[PDB]
């Protein structure tokens, strides 16, 4: 069934399926109605009442329940001629506030249509349901086709990103970012595929190795990288730019993925209904009774690095076999049949490491009573016992010009193997990516398409040092948009002639950023660094200094009234509240060189290659030694942004619909909560007052021609044929400036013409 019309794979759960009847009876608009919030107590969940008033100073209307209270034309959220229901790019709206769009966004959803537009902004709200909208024909309907000629889709920004490059020959970016719970993992999970097939190399159906050797390189990532939390069954657990290259003709060539921040904590600790990195269960749950004692696990329940928080009982999908997939994916993108055993040789020495119970030493001196965990735990990494344990409880500190063997009590031996138990996962993994990257990795690399998988503003009263870094990058981003989409009105003003009494809008947030990473005048990250320099620092000081530098001195910083262990910043979207605690330690990630020394050698080319390579056990030795997680997280985002700033971008946003994994309900308590969370609506409502239902430009020929006698169809050209109409009828010229070449009906000056049906 040819792609044209209605009745197939596409129109059904993809395209709003237009009707088999042709004329303007699909609907007809008159009168008006306003959105509103029945209860003056709740700022969510509005309603719909008919206007009866048109006050000059005020505005008034009807209601369902009795009340008939009034509302300033300015605080009123209007409702559109219900002729726009599932309108594909929302700019086409006439009136826009919120309710007016959690509405257009729901109908777009009632019909199971996750994808939508905001001019430049694709909104995509995760369904949780299974909706075939990806199959191989969803592809051949897109390839080589224009955003106009097809309903919205990930496959509809994912090609554009490709074609523009081919022709508007320039490196290209895709930026996907959403509240973690948003499925932004699958979105990316498709751009790669889609591209991979159109620039997919075979005759008409196939792809020879490379293009595939790639597809299986996420299973690795998802296997360790992704993990399952209250918010999902499989949470993108980490940030990364997976990013890919081609040769000039058009055929895909390379890939290079760089990752960063991970909940390295998800190893030692997880909570209610939570589990671990899946590598961990399929590990035990999947190894033939053979290798299971080849290293000795027996019970996964038997383990406490896994048998703590409730649900390890592994909901829905089967994993026993998912193993044959990941393990089937590593030595397919080529992973040795011998060494990739070590991965395992490792994932378990970790496990035995979360099983030892250093018990208060008689008097003091904390010590383990008996030992087989550790004996075993050492017997895969291959590291002598009177060594491993000794650096652990008895680590050699250096007081001045002499250095000795302190004996830890529990209070601290307790958290050592805790902190060393991430140093490996955090580590193995980083290098583990280091591998496959460096063969999908490319050389001259003519062009590239990088795609960005980053998070939204993680805002919670429990946010700490981490919450900042990700939120520092986010701010860093919404200028890239605001500034980029700024230079938009740049060309815009070379073809509508003379330009707007203008904003010259610059960073309204160079400010906030400057407060974080400001050199001089310094910022949070400066003092963080500045003090991380020695011990007699008691985060107590850390905050005391801050309120001195900042408090009553920076528009974005606020000092709490009664609370003292914490403060608050005023980010792009409202305030954030960071508490301090171990920021001073979390800033280093310390670990005794009594231990490296114990693991910097072994039997094993990798746990040697882990604490033996300078780009895996270290960071560039600057200012005499290691630079801090704060300084670095600066060195690398900027580099990232640097790159971004030289490529064309396309932003995609992932809206989480509800908090219990429920496909079906779609609660305004959340969606809305974030709609504002992104500059999606306010992205224009503020920005494009000036040109309304930005058409395919100035095309007054047979598209809309029912006006009685005077405004015809094709006079001489696609521009003029009736102009002396608003200068005349309705009101004046103002609505439309008159650029020599282009012009725009400012719809916003309509109240004398276009509301009835004929």
UniProtKB/Swiss-Prot annotation:
Region annotation Actin-binding: where it falls in the sequence: 637-659, 737-751
Ranges where the Myosin N-terminal SH3-like domain occurs: 29-81
N6,N6-dimethyllysine: modified positions: 129
Post-translational changes noted in the entry: Phosphorylation inhibits thick filament formation and reduces the actin-activated ATPase activity.
Compartments (UniProt record): Cytoplasm, Cell cortex
Binding site for ATP: 178-185
Myosin motor domain boundaries: 85-758
UniProt remark on domains: Limited proteolysis of myosin heavy chain produces 1 light meromyosin (LMM) and 1 heavy meromyosin (HMM). HMM can be further cleaved into 2 globular subfragments (S1) and 1 rod-shaped subfragment (S2). The rodlike tail sequence is highly repetitive, showing cycles of a 28-residue repeat pattern composed of 4 heptapeptides, characteristic for alpha-helical coiled coils.
UniProt similarity note: Belongs to the TRAFAC class myosin-kinesin ATPase superfamily. Myosin family.
The protein's role, per its UniProt record: Myosin is a protein that binds to actin and has ATPase activity that is activated by actin.
UniProt subunit comment: Myosin-2 heavy chain is two-headed. It self-assembles into filaments. Hexamer of 2 heavy chain subunits (MHC), 2 alkali light chain subunits (MLC) and 2 regulatory light chain subunits (MLC-2). Associates with elmoA.
Remarks, miscellaneous: Dictyostelium myosin-2 has no K(2)EDTA ATPase activity, perhaps correlated with the absence of a Cys at the SH-1 position (688).
Name recorded for this polypeptide: Myosin-2 heavy chain
Top-level taxonomy: Eukaryota, Amoebozoa, Evosea, Eumycetozoa, Dictyostelia
């Amino acid at each position: 069934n040819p792609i044209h019309d209605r009745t197939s794979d596409y129109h059904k759960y993809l395209k709003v399926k237009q009707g088999d009847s042709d004329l303007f009876k699909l609907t007809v608009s008159d009168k008006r109605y306003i959105w509103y919030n029945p209860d003056p107590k709740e700022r969510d969940s509005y309603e719909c009442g008919e206007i009866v008033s048109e006050t000059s100073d005020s505005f008034t209307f009807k209601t369902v329940d009795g009340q008939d209270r009034q509302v300033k034309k300015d605080d009123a959220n209007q409702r559109n001629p219900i002729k726009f229901d599932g309108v594909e790019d929302m700019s086409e709206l006439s009136y826009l506030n919120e309710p007016a769009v959690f509405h257009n966004l729901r109908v777009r959803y009632n019909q199971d249509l996750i994808y939508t537009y905001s001019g430049l902004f694709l909104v995509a709200v995760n369904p949780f349901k299974r909706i075939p909208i990806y199959t191989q024909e969803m592809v051949d309907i897109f390839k080589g086709r224009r955003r106009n000629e097809v309903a919205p889709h990930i496959f509809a920004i994912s090609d554009v990103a490709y074609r523009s490059m081919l022709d508007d020959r320039q490196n290209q970016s895709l930026l996907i970012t959403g509240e973690s719970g948003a499925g932004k993992t699958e979105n990316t999970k498709k751009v790669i595929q889609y591209l991979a097939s159109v620039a997919g190399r075979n005759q008409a159906n196939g792809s020879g190795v490379l293009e595939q050797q790639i597809l299986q390189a996420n299973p690795i990532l998802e296997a360790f990288g992704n993990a399952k939390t209250t918010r999902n069954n499989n949470s993108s657990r980490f940030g990364k730019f997976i990013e890919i290259q081609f040769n000039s003709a058009g055929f895909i060539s390379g890939a290079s993925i760089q990752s960063y921040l991970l909940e390295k904590s998800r190893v030692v600790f997880q909570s209610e209904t939570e589990r671990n990195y899946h590598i961990f269960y399929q590990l035990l749950a999947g190894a033939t009774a053979e290798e299971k004692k080849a290293l000795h696990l027996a019970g996964p329940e038997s383990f406490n690095y896994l048998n703590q928080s409730g649900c390890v009982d592994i909901k829905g999908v089967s994993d026993s076999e998912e193993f044959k997939i990941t393990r089937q994916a590593m030595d397919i993108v080529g992973f040795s049949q011998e060494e990739q055993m070590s991965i395992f040789k490792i994932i378990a020495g970790i496990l035995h490491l979360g099983n030892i119970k250093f018990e208060k030493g008689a008097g003091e001196g904390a010590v383990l009573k008996d030992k087989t965990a550790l004996n075993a735990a050492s017997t895969v990494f291959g590291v002598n016992p009177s060594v491993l344990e000794k650096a652990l409880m008895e680590p050699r500190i250096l007081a001045g010009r002499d250095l000795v063997a302190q004996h830890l009590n529990v209070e601290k031996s307790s958290s050592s193997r805790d902190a060393l138990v991430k140093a490996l996962y955090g580590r193995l993994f980083l290098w583990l990516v280091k591998k496959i990257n460096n063969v999908l990795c490319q050389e001259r690399k003519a062009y590239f398409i990088g795609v960005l998988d980053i998070s939204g503003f993680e805002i919670f009263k429990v946010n700490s040092f981490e919450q900042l870094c990700i939120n520092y990058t986010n701010e860093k981003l919404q200028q890239f948009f605001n500034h980029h989409m700024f230079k938009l009105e740049q060309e815009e003003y070379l073809k509508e002639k003379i330009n707007w009494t203008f904003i010259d809008f610059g960073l309204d947030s160079q400010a906030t950023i400057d407060l974080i990473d400001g050199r001089q005048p310094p910022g949070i990250l400066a003092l963080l660094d500045e003090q991380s320099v020695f011990p007699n620092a008691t985060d107590n000081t850390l905050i005391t200094k801050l309120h001195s530098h900042f408090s009553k001195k920076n528009a974005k910083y606020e000092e709490p009234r009664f609370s003292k262990t914490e403060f608050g910043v005023t980010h792009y979207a409202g305030q954030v509240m960071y508490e301090i605690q171990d920021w001073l330690e979390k800033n280093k990630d310390p670990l005794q060189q009594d231990l490296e020394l114990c693991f910097k050698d072994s039997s094993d080319n990798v746990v040697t290659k882990l604490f033996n390579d300078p780009n895996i056990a270290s960071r560039a030795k600057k200012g005499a030694n290691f630079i801090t997680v704060a300084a670095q997280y600066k060195e690398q985002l900027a580099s990232l942004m640097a790159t971004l700033e030289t490529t064309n971008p396309h932003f995609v946003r992932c809206i989480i619909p509800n908090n219990k994994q429920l496909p079906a309900k779609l609660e305004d308590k959340v969606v809305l909560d974030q709609l504002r969370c992104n500059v999606v609506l306010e992205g224009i409502r503020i920005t494009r007052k000036g040109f309304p239902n930005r058409i395919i430009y100035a095309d007054f020929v047979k598209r809309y021609y029912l006006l009685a006698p005077n405004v015809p169809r094709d006079a001489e050209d696609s521009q003029k044929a009736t102009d002396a109409v608003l200068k005349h009828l309705n009101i004046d010229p103002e609505q439309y400036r008159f650029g020599i070449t282009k012009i725009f009906f400012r719809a916003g000056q309509l109240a004398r013409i276009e509301e009835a049906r004929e």
